[PDB]
């Protein structure tokens with residue numbers, strides 16, 4: 001493995017020009033700048049691309065202690081600049097007082113040299129796509145790969161987590177900082193592990209929240225999901241079953257689940273299903289629910305949605321705005337393309353299609369909610385380029401001074417087992433905070449858990465870390481322990 005420090009250093013001498021972020025409503029309130037990075041760090045004098053940065057300066061200059069870099073997006077496919085705006089609105093005031101918060105879109109999406117390939121709306125849901133039948137899905141996923149191959153072949157070798165880690169080093173140098181702090185979620189926690197593994201002597205304080213397993217790269221991210229999807233759905237069903245009076249879905253978790261399964265039975269046989277006046281298909285009937293289950297505070301929304309698919313017409317106004325937020329528009333395309341490129345650019349997927357059919361059929365039986373969608377054939381199996389570098393070896397020689405891991409005990413897409421594995425791999429420099437009785441993605445600061453907020457703030461502000469892993473309770477749990 002090679003760091004390519006010479007090429008990184010070559011681009012660290014930049015001094016970006018910051019101005020108000022005036023060209024996008026969600027970013028008003030922030031400054032914006034552009035940076036150049038090489039496409040290929042083995043070819044520093046070759047082709048380059050531009051990254052879009054945003055910043056919110058420390059509100060108390062006399063107390064400023066450094067830069068807090070936000071990992072470039074939570075779930076892979078999402079924009080880091082938009083995450084930074086969200087965080088500026090919800091981080092503790094004292095964190096905002098002492099840190100310049102800097103965020104960025106990683107290479108190939110958003111404000112950072114976006115790549116689009118003509119993907120149709122259905123194609124942008126390739127990750128959670130539920131198959132008609134296996135032969136149809138082979139063709140569906142192969143054709144997704146075909147579009148990216150045709151329109152982006154020349155940059156696909158350079159879509160990797162290690163290159164984003166080098167990009168982070170360029171940002172750090174450009175900001176003029178010897179050390180930076182880091183806050184990351186989901187894919188941002190894999191990037192945080194990689195960047196600290198490669199360059200962690202330059203880390204100050206590091207918080208990773210809702211943790212990618214180090215074992216996942218990258219098909220395990222998919223094949224570990226269905227059991228956690230089933231568990232999260234069942235937890236909601238228990239919550240719904242205690243509320244039959246107000247929801248009308250059933251008085252046992254089995255009955256609520258059968259109500260929902262009846263909606264799946266319908267889309268899985270091209271029988272019409274609508275939520276308000278908006279049609280569901282095999283994928284959306286499951287993905288709308290996955291989207292809700294990313295936070296157990298959405299349980300009421302999900303009751304309204306399932307009720308509206310079974311009987312009703314209208315949804316409650318609140319639910320309509322939240323669903324319109326989340327779906328309403330097509331999934332942002334360049335993020336879909338970058339998500340494909342990274343998942344296949346980091347690591348070579350199996351290419352034998354019989355493996356996927358076997359796995360799809362087994363997972364459809366053991367975990368029906370999302371088994372077939374997660375374990376079956378996916379576009380990286382047909383990818384036109386191999387990885388340019390081996391996967392980073394994460395391990396207890398990680399040079400970061402300290403890493404705090406934050407994890408909701410019942411989170412779905414990044415489960416507690418994944419955080420525990422990351423803790424084992426990173427070794428004694430890391431500590432794990434588990435938040436009990438909480439099925440939520442991105443705990444600090446978004447959930448408002450007093451215990452997590454207090455412990456993370458004490459680390460970021462004062463450098464306090466517990467002596468060993470700790471648990472904190474949820475004082476307002478959606479269901480009993």
Ligand SMILES: COC(=O)/C=C(\C)[C@@]12O[C@]13c1cc(O)c4c(c1N[C@H]2C#C/C=C\C#C[C@H]3O)C(=O)c1ccccc1C4=O
Pocket residue numbers: 074075076077125127128186187188190211212221222225287290291292294326331339413414
């Ligand atoms: C790569 O590191 C991670 O830990 C990533 C994840 C746990 C996920 O980001 C991933 C998702 C990919 C999507 O395409 C998602 C979503 C992702 N969430 C995480 C997941 C998962 C399981 C397979 C995957 C993946 C990642 O690309 C997602 O939650 C959605 C919710 C509601 C609307 C749409 C979606 C999506 O389309």
